[PDB]
Structures are given as structure tokens and as C-alpha cells.
Amino acid sequence: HMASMKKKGSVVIVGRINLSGDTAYAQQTRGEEGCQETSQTGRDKNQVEGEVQIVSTATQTFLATSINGVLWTVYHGAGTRTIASPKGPVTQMYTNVDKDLVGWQAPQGSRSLTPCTCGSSDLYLVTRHADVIPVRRRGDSRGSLLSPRPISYLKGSAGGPLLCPAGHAVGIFRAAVSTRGVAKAVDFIPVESLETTM
Numbered sequence: 001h002m003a004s005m006k007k008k009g010s011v012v013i014v015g016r017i018n019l020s021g022d023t024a025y026a027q028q029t030r031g032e033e034g035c036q037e038t039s040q041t042g043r044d045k046n047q048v049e050g051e052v053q054i055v056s057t058a059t060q061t062f063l064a065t066s067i068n069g070v071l072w073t074v075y076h077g078a079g080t081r082t083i084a085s086p087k088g089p090v091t092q093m094y095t096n097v098d099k100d101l102v103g104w105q106a107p108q109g110s111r112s113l114t115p116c117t118c119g120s121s122d123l124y125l126v127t128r129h130a131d132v133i134p135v136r137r138r139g140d141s142r143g144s145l146l147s148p149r150p151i152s153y154l155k156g157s158a159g160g161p162l163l164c165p166a167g168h169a170v171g172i173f174r175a176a177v178s179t180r181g182v183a184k185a186v187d188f189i190p191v192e193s194l195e196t197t198m
């Protein structure tokens, strides 16, 4: 009944993949209880840093990547949710279920990647565990893993970036191409598709 109808919480930034130095590593910035509270209020006072955030809802955790002043992630993780911010919940600026893509204005303190113009096919996927996995581009939205991985290894990394050698954004990881639980390739939203959305 109407009086007891609930609202979904906000997406909450709970960590980042630190790419600032010579070593990529995951950092947690909020534990489970704080995450739950922040999802409910939508008020996140934490300082945000970096290009790749680790984000959570009540039920899932995944990644989000800042490119050209927008924090992007997958619809299959975020749905239509707001994101928590210092001033309360922030509404999506982009939503496209057909691309599996959503975006919010990039948090103050975040750094954005630049869309790649290199037209190069040697790529690098960054996972939620801060693994940097070489990927050979095989089409507009596909790349092959030079070393195949169990899908367990990739789960929770949707929303993270594929980067070129010079560190530009080439795409956003969307889905694993897998057989018998082994991923040989990845499917990604190309950055040009983001640029068109913008």
C-alpha cells in the first residue's frame, strides 16, 4: 500500500582504483555500514579522488569511470538510481538502457579520462581488484583477452575502463563473452558511443 512504499537508495562510492602512481591498487573508502547509511540519505561527505570509482548499491558492487566530466557506469548495476554526494542525491544526467549506460555529473575532486583519438587496437582493462589486463581490440565493441580468465575474476568490474597505451579512455566494460565459465573476450561500450550520448 502507498503509505509504506519504499524508495531505492542511491549508488554510493565506496572506494577507488588508484592509478596515480607506478602501481595500480584498490582502496576502500567506506565500509558496509557507512555504505548502507549513505545509500539511504544520499549524503556522502567523503572526498572523491581519481578516475575509477568503486560503487555499490544495497545488493551489488561494480565500477564507475569519469570521462569528460561525467561519471559513467552500467545500467544493469545502477538502474535509474541517484548517486550520493555532499549535497544529497544527484539525478542521472544520462540514461540509456539500450547501451547499458548511465552517467552523473562527475563528483568534485574526481579526475576525468580523455576520450582516445589514437585509433589504436592495443588496449588495457582495469578490474575492481586493480588488475590491468591486456585486451586486443577485435571490433567496435569487442576485445579478446590475451590470457582467458574465469568469469569470477571479472564479476563486479562492469563500469570500469578500457584504456589505450597512452591512458585515454577507449570504452566502458559491459559484459563478458564466456563459455563454460571462462571468459575469452569482453564486450564494451565504445567511447565514441559515450561521446554521441554527450
Ligand SMILES: CC(C)(C)OC(=O)N[C@H]1CCCCC/C=C\[C@@H]2C[C@@]2(C(=O)NS(=O)(=O)C2CC2)NC(=O)[C@@H]2C[C@@H](OC(=O)n3cc4cccc(F)c4c3)CN2C1=O
Pocket (backbone or CB within 6 Å): 060, 061, 062, 063, 074, 076, 077, 078, 097, 098, 099, 100, 151, 152, 154, 155, 156, 157, 158, 159, 173, 174, 175, 176, 177, 178, 187
Ligand atoms: C552480451 C553477451 C555477449 C551475450 O555477453 C553476456 O551477456 N555475458 C554476461 C555474462 C555474465 C557472467 C558474469 C560476467 C562477469 C562480468 C561481467 C562484466 C559484468 C559485470 O561484472 N557485471 S557486475 O557484476 O559488475 C554487475 C553489478 C553490475 N557484466 C555482466 O555481468 C553482464 C550483465 C548482463 O548483460 C546485460 O545486462 N547487458 C545489457 C546490454 C545492453 C547492450 C549490450 C550488451 F552487451 C548488454 C549486456 C549479463 N552480463 C554478462 O556479462
Ligand SMILES: [Zn+2]
Pocket (backbone or CB within 6 Å): 115, 116, 117, 118, 119, 120, 164, 165, 166, 167, 168
Ligand atoms: Zn589514445
